[PDB]
């Protein structure tokens, strides 16, 4: 209804993208979940950058 996926996830830990395919996120922020069907790298949209983050770093608000 806005992008390919929502679900909402909560950043537990602060994450600095180590690659341009990753995203920089600060814990406490609520991100949009674009992909959670991947076992390792989830896709989230934060600020204006929608890329990958570690599944173990974000929590399901869903």
From Swiss-Prot:
Residue ranges of domain SH3 in the record: 4-62
Coiled-coil segments: none
Compartments, record wording: Cytoplasm, Cytoskeleton; Cytoplasm, Cell cortex
Functional summary from the UniProt entry: Morphologically, spectrin-like proteins appear to be related to spectrin, showing a flexible rod-like structure. They can bind actin but seem to differ in their calmodulin-binding activity. In nonerythroid tissues, spectrins, in association with some other proteins, may play an important role in membrane organization.
Family indicated by similarity: Belongs to the spectrin family.
Subunit structure: Like erythrocyte spectrin, the spectrin-like proteins are capable of forming dimers which can further associate to tetramers. Interacts with ACP1.
Protein name, UniProt field: Spectrin alpha chain, non-erythrocytic 1
Species, as recorded: Gallus gallus
Lineage, highest ranks first: Eukaryota, Metazoa, Chordata, Craniata, Vertebrata
């Amino acid at each position: 209804m806005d992008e390919t996926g929502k679900e909402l996830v909560l950043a537990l830990y602060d994450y600095q993208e180590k690659s341009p395919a990753e995203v920089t996120m600060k814990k406490g922020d609520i991100l949009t979940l674009l992909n959670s069907t991947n076992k390792d790298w989830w896709k989230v949209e934060v600020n204006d950058r929608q890329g990958f983050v570690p599944a173990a770093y974000v929590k399901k608000l869903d």
